[PDB]
From a paper:
The structure of QDE-1 ΔN was initially solved by multiwavelength anomalous diffraction (MAD) analysis of a crystal of selenomethionated protein, expressed in yeast, to a resolution of 3.2 Å. The structure was then refined against a higher resolution dataset extending to 2.3 Å. These crystals belong to space group P21, and the crystallographic asymmetric unit contains two subunits, which together form a compact pyramidal object with dimensions of 90 × 70 × 127 Å3. The two constituent subunits are related by an approximate 2-fold axis and are in such intimate contact (over 2,000 Å2 of contact area per subunit) that we would expect this to represent a functional dimer. QDE-1 ΔN has 1,026 residues, and the final model contains 933 residues in subunit A and 930 residues in subunit B (residues are missing from the N- and C-termini and from some flexible loops). The refined structure at 2.3 Å has an Rwork of 21.7% (Rfree = 26.4%), and the stereochemistry is good (root mean square deviation [rmsd] bond = 0.013 Å, rmsd angle = 1.9°, 2.3% of residues are in disallowed regions of the Ramachandran plot; Table 1). The proposed dsRNA product binding channels are not identical in the two subunits, because the disposition of the domains is different: subunit A has a “closed” conformation, with the head and slab clamped down on the active site cleft, whereas an 11° rotation of the head and 2° rotation of the slab render the B subunit more open and provide space for an RNA duplex. Analysis of electron density maps showed a Mg2+ ion coordinated by these aspartic acid side chains (the functional significance of this is underscored by the observation that the QDE-1 polymerase activity is dependent on divalent cations).
Numbering used by the authors:
A (entry chain A): 390 to 589, 604 to 627, 641 to 1240, 1252 to 1270, 1282 to 1372
B (entry chain B): 390 to 590, 607 to 626, 641 to 1240, 1252 to 1270, 1282 to 1372
Amino acid sequence: HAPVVAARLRNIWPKFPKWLHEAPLAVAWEVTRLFMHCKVDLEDESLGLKYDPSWSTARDVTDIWKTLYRLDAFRGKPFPEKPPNDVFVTAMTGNFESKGSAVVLSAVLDYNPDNSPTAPLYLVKLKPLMFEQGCRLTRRFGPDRFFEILIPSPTSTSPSVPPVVSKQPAAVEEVIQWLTMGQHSLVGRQWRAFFAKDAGPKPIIKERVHFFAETGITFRPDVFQRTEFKVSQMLDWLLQLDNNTWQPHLKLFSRIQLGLSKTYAIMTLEPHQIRHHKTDLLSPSGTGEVMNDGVGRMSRSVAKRIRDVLGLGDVPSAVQGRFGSAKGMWVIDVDDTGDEDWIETYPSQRKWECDFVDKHQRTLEVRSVASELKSAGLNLQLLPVLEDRARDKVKMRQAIGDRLINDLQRQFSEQKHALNRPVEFRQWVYESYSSRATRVSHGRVPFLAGLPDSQEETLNFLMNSGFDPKKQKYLQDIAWDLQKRKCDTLKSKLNIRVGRSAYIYMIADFWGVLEENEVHVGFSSKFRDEEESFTLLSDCDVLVARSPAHFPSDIQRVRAVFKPELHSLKDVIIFSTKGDVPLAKKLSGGDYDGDMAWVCWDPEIVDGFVNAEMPLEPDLSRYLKKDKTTFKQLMASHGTGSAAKEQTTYDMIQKSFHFALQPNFLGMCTNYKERLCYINNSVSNKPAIILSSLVGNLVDQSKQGIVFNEASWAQLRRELLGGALSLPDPMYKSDSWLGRGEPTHIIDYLKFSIARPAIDKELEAFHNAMKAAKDTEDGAHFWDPDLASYYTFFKEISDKSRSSALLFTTLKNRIGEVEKEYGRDPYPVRVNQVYEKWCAITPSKVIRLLELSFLADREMNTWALLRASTAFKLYYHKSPKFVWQMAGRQLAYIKAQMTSRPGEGAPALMTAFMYAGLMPDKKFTKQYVARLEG
Amino acid sequence: HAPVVAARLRNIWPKFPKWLHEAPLAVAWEVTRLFMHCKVDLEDESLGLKYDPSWSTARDVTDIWKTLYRLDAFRGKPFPEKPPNDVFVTAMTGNFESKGSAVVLSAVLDYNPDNSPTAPLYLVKLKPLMFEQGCRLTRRFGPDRFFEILIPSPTSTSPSVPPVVSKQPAAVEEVIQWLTMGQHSLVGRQWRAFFAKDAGYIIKERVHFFAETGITFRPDVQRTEFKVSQMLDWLLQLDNNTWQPHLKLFSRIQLGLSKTYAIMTLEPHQIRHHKTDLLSPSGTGEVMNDGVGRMSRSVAKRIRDVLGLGDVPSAVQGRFGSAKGMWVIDVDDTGDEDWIETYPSQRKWECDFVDKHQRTLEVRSVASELKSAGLNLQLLPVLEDRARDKVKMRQAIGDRLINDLQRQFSEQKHALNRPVEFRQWVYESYSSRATRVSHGRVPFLAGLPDSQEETLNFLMNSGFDPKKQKYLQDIAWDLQKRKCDTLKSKLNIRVGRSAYIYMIADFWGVLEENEVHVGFSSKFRDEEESFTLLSDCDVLVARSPAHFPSDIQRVRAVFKPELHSLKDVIIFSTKGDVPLAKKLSGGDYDGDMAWVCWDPEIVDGFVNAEMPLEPDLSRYLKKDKTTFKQLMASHGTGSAAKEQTTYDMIQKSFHFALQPNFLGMCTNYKERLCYINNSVSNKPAIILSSLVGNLVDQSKQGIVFNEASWAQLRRELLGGALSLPDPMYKSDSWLGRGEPTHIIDYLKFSIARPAIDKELEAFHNAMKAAKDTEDGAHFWDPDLASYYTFFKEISDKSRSSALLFTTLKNRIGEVEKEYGRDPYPVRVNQVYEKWCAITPSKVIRLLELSFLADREMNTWALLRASTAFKLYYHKSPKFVWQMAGRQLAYIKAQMTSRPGEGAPALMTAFMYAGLMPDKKFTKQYVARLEG
Ligand SMILES: [Mg+2]
Ligand SMILES: [Mg+2]
């Protein structure tokens, strides 16, 4: 209770008018969206609202917007963005649920740029209805009963946050109280907060908050759509609270995320089909150490059901999932020769005490599956530890630079060779980037004005109509904008490719075949590395790591040993359950609940590496303070019985929100450590070991109830290190070397001595080159006489003209006006505005032939061809980007028309849909070129 | 000798003029491939000879005949097949070799339809110059010194053979004598015969000649005179191999002719000749690695390098000096030195390995990624013979087949319901990639692709729907009907978990006797399941064909981590009494592939039989073991004696190679008798299996087996005499008394046929769908009359465009009538040409767009297409689609376009040809469509 805030925090939500009370939920949502967007008051008695019965039977939101919009006070604009039909229909008529998909209600709040109280404080924008995979909780209670927002973090220091908040210490407590203390009215439902978490110049970080529709004007009581139901009951259903009062309440709150986890429901197992183990697999040496933390077995038939319901090409050996209170990985049991369904759970997987009685507690839900692997490369954060652990550091660093030079050289040579033939460049462009998901989503290649959205898609669209990247400069320009952007990425990220490396799910050996420093890695298919291929790993040393590696010991060198017993387990890496300490825990305190290891079998990288033992970590208890307060201790303030328990549940939500919304120091302490280790050039001295241990403890902050605030951070740097004082940014944060003399630090050296010269050298190759193209014949020009085809045709006519003539003059004039418009807000919207003026350039008997009005799509007429070519003749000069962006599409048609030859096959006019479904045939390319080359 | 036949063959070959002794060998070819076709001769007179040149410096062909025909001349329908430029260039300027390819001189002889005696007997046609992979012999002596012909076999037997030869018994000796006794003049060279064998593909035999001299050669002891006897002595180092049976020695000549890639020449210190093979550990003395040896890892990387393979191959089939067989990477090789070994069982003659060409590794083939083999019908009788429960075996195979049949019929019918899906199915139903590669586009006949399948996709890609447009519906139907025929004629048992795999022997002592190791180079996919290797299961292995009950064996797949690096080969134990390979129809490790099957249903019921007690067939099978040394005894000693002995061996061995092949005949008899007996394990079956097994090695075993022997065998051990009928399953229908009882009969006629016929009833019930079910699919499409209606509207206030439109309709009508009225593609073209001939101030300039080099991209072509459609969709649907399909598709794609719903794409013919349907798009897109 500040109050300052309030009154601000009014009144934050859009009102729900009486004329709109006959819903339905989806209409209410999407109509409210048109009103907020157009800036139209929903409690306006000047507009004569109303309620279109027709909206009730609507299957396209555009129908409940063209209403409307109409009215005159809606124009505007167009948009909102608009929910897809299939989504809208599901929300309207399919229960907010389409197979596995939930319809999602979401909003983003940004600080009100306004001011004074009684202005809101937050502006709310409602997202369009959308599909996202469901979760336990939306399958149990209905997707329509869940609402999520992104909201500016109230403890965000700083400086672009309103004064009103935080120069008024605690009302951080007022914001949370607003969030949690009562219900929020939105679109005729009563929403109550039950979860908060971090989100999925310098902006204010937002936190994601989840609300449950406890009631609304359509619900009904109760005990004993759609029935009233409290958040305390919902969470009791999820967590079986009666049996979990012993738990620290912050930790218990953190388990709510397991009901929100986006997962595929696979199958419900019978009780007799479930094996709950009372004990984990423990260290053989008596350390009491858990050797299979987060991992269990499943039967083979269970894994086949997962292939089945998910539609996988193959039975997966392991999956990341949930099952009642159990969370982690399940791996097929290699000893299963039966065909009966079963699964097991271990104490380390079970996050609360669950009776596993209702079918939703006994349903296997899949988050992700072990899939075919792809090369990982080397991230620059691994480098300092790799260098630290090198038997010889000068050679390590010479080698890593050579590798980066070579890989770069290698990717340039392949690009420039492929460029020499359209079939080959198309194949290279296709392989460089996946567009299939975009294509599946739109039922076509999406266009911005006259060309595809995507640069890659633009290249192939144009080459498929006969343009040549070595002949047309525009194709050339894009081809190298692309190679530039990729150089930028390499110097920023230093993602040096290492062909023999992959991220692989870690699994523990239940079967007792791997000795302590042995790992088993078999692949589901051929893993290719330039000249060499692998279906498995055997008799070689490998490096394993989890990202991020901080301690010198966070990367380990071990022996890859293929065990025939584990032959069936593919695309996972199995660690021994022998020894004192599981290998997983040595890899940055990891485990087997979904962790993936960086696995590297590259000889040059593996062979110079020397293992370090675990660090003696410091006691940080003075700075890191765990709140261990249990649900039982919170309930003692209210007493005993159902009302006591209900209020305790809400206490837990409120205290845990107050915890979740505190600043994240993980990021801050990680950056300090980056900076400190950089200046010291050491990842193994005492300060380095202290900070690595620090950030290691902050990773589990949320479920450990670790309190760590600003005063404690300062105290810890004061007492154990620095340099309150900002440490300078590493030099490698800048684009050019701003250091003194030669780079000494390995990242500076790799970015500045190696990558930057090599890039600029590789770019001096084809600017050279440009330049070498006047008329060697080759080279690459903007001009193409083929595309002035219709121009010259109608100028001849035009001559000759009378008055075609006049038509042709207006045309050139209008194009000129629109190029001027192109010369002068987000980018795609502005381009569209110009595209629309472009399309508005419109024309007995000559106009009828140019117009072909029997075609519903204007942009397929002969006029569009003429307009495109005239614009080309006039502007290929001059404004090359203007012409291609507006008319790319018809330039392509003209090109395919013009290059066609009698008796040399037929050009194909493909529908947008049918075109999106084809891919380059790599065998064709390869075989066709092979015959071209004798 | 033999009175006639001579001189009824002493010209045969041109006929090599004054006068063209000059100008490169290629030029000559090639020119003497013109008196050949078409005519002229020797021999003149008229009209002008010798020189051009270029000719004597050309780079085409092509040309040359462009000198030609002065002449005038012929004028003989200017068409010889014609050698490719790069080939001709190589033969002209590149030594007949580039770099791995040899230029090949070949001809085909057919019997002279003429007669009597002074006429040739053979007509010879010279093939155009061509590239083929070289061999040891062309690399050593030059591809230009070798000439090969196909020649009718003088011992066939019969009917369509000239009189002329047999019934003049033993002029078969006269033909061979002609072939071998002396030199043959051809294009200015003197060719001598040194090898004969059966053809690569009245049966003809392939004969090989070597240019011993010619009017460009030079004395000794381009280039130099050299005898066939010297060339063979270089190859086989005859001095040290006189101990060999001369037929077997002759057989080894094939090793010099084997088409191989030269990889690298190893130094002497890098070669390891073992004096002994790996022998049975039981003391049987059996060779356990027959035909196989190890190579170092660096050698195998050199093979990947020079062959441009994507990976190091674990094993290769090759030659190396006298050694023939497989070489496998030594898994124990941790060095990087080049080495190879040879074994007695690999070495086919005593070789010093001195010459670089005796020490060059030559690759015939390499172990490559595997694909599914399925089950060959020939294996079924033995699978059934060895079934623990034959009733259950037969039932599973039929169930397997019924299910496959119903699956593939239901999949076509389902795919039909969505154009993305039907396009995918159509694409997967037949491969068009090679046609597309060859043409640089999809070939069209008139207005539509050549191919029905390509037509379906072309039309669907512009927006037509096979459930809506009857034209597409009729084609799809036609394809299934057509597929049904093929199924009835081609019984197919489908088995995903099987492959043919190169057999290799375990040099490393890790596999127990009934264990095999199989690792794959990549994922071997079978519908629901994938394998990168085989472990902990039983597998069946066999070599095709399997004859004896024991020719298929069930063994244990055990993955040995020591052998993990060996991929796409199967490794057999070198323990036990007898090598597994030998049990697989007398096989070995020199290139044999095993049928490997790990399908549980097929493996499970199988019970191993032991090796059969084979009968003594000495009386019928007669081995001539006469050695080269015994042949040489009739001439004496020294170089002259040796030379004539070599020619002796060619003559004698030609006489042996040209005798009828009974392997085929005895194999057919066995199939027919075992079918009648419904037994592959009774006494006549064992006798016939043992017979054909002995006939496989006939050539290098010098086994003589003629008609008298075959008839005596049949008489004594069998058998009619008497022609066995064909098995019922060689006829298309069952005819056939009652129910099929033979397993193949049962599967074909009792299982497959009733399923196929139940499916020809499904389609025919849907033919009568039909009337006006509103679906129905129709020929009518108002989209396709687009331009028609547009121009009738303009022609209404005509005045003028009316007249233009009236001529158009008229001329289309004339061409429709022409379509109503040789071969097929030629006639269609004629009509297409008249159709394209239908051609048109400002309106005609807009319709014509003459700046377009391709007429058929005109707005007029669109107008012509739709007015033809409007006027004829009803009456002559095939006419309009055949002529105008192309533009009907353009119209459809234009019409069907909607603003803000994406852009149609005008693809070039070439760029369209290089795209395939994306299976993942199909699959993901429909998944989204279905909620
Ligand atoms: Mg974990
Ligand atoms: Mg063999």
